[PDB]
Amino acid sequence: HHHHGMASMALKNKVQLITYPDSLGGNLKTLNDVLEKYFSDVFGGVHILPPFPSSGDRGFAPITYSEIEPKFGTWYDIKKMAENFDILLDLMVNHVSRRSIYFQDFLKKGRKSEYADMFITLDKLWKDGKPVKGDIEKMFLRRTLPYSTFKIEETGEEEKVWTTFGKTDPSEQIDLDVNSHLVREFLLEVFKTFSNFGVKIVRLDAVGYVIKKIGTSCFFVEPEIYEFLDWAKGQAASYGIELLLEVHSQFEVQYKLAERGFLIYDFILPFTVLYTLINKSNEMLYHYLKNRPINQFTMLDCHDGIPVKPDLDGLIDTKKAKEVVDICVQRGANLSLIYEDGFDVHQINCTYYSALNCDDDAYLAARAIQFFTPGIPQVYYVGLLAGVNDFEAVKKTKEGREINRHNYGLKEIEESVQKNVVQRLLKLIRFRNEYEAFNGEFFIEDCRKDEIRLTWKKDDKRCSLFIDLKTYKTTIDYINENGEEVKYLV
């Protein structure tokens, strides 16, 4: 029922960092050093993108969760960080590396492997294990074919298993059968491992894909998906873990998840803030702020691109979606597509600072809007350092999403944090962490279309954001410790 289990939910309301384990100095030890040097009271939590040994997709093809990738560090590095920050880690509920012991044993022994049932051999979907084109055509495909062919060593036979994702063929990412008792035991063991080292929040990667059903899109298949979500939520709670679901879908799916008591990502705000600032109009933002669940993790940038379709379906027309997309692409962006007909832009791959034309004032305005929006605010490491599009990584790797995944060395971090725009952002972050009003009541204030006025109130504390969208001048009027109203020019 409504907001099930949320009576006990009380998350720390402080800004969090999103980073790769190696993108701030090269490993978890340099990450910890950088956090201690510059950011101890800047972040209340850290989402470390997948730090387990992985065979592809920069961490999202995990081989095992029982150790941290040794290039990055050890589980004790995570435990030490958890002493100072809330740690958020990924659970790849949908797939595991083909190089895991589970799948390599299966490729050796075929059906006599004790792990065979962990994987979606095609006989679980079709009587004879033969794919049917008409059925595939109904599916939401994320690669040309949603399966891969492997050779069973002991029999020499060819076997197909489901692989939703994978840039190589065969894919490195083998889908898990979440109906298998063996998979549920496997996932439970990861929760236990995570909990053992202090992890408090777990992101369910690609959770929308876990239910396969012939005749459906195989994306967020109801009601089956909710049986898995309910199971996973209760087991995670047994180990002290809250689940954060990652679902790129139409807003009705996200809203129903929140209505049913699941934490979600705010995948509408990133585009909404871009549109607000590019067009100097608060109308879309105000409509969204008045009609959205508040128990969301907010972001501008993350490790993926800025969502467009399906996340904004029914909320913006193609004209305005294309306006913002085209402007971002003129500013260096590349696009991830749904994959010939219609508007098919899935995400805008672009640093958020570059998307705003490197306009410091507009970028600080964007973060102020984010931090004044109800929800737990997350700052991606590239945006923390006001990073611009990494064209070298795009040209060298031919991977568009690497535009927003630059790896910073220590010396480059030392230089970047001294930039005026970064120092302004750090001051704003600390204000959002320190000022008590953000833990109180939220009010959307009347104002002109080219203004933004948002207020938080708690006890004698109150802070009121004002943005002039004509100039992007961003001011916060707040009550200081002596009860005096003070003006903070962001």
Numbering used by the authors: 7 to 345, 352 to 502
Paper text:
Glycoside phosphorylases (GPs) are carbohydrate-active enzymes that catalyze the reversible cleavage of glycosidic bonds using inorganic phosphate. One of the most well-studied GPs in that regard is sucrose phosphorylase (SP; EC 2.4.1.7), which catalyzes the phosphorolysis of sucrose into α-d-glucose 1-phosphate (Glc1P) and d-fructose. Instead, a clear preference for sucrose 6F-phosphate was observed, making it the first sucrose 6F-phosphate phosphorylase (SPP; EC 2.4.1.329) ever reported. Crystal structures of the two SPPs were determined to allow for a comparison of their active site.
Furthermore, the T. thermosaccharolyticum SPP (TtSPP) was shown to accept an even wider range of substrates than the known SPs, offering opportunities for biotechnological applications and further engineering. The IcSPP crystals contained one protein molecule in the asymmetric unit, whereas the TtSPP crystals contained two. IcSPP seems to exist as a monomer, whereas TtSPP in the crystal structure forms dimers. These catalytic residues are, respectively, found at Asp197, Glu238, and Asp296 in TtSPP. One tetrahedral sulfate ion is present in subsite +1 of TtSPP. In TtSPP, on the other hand, a histidine residue is present instead.
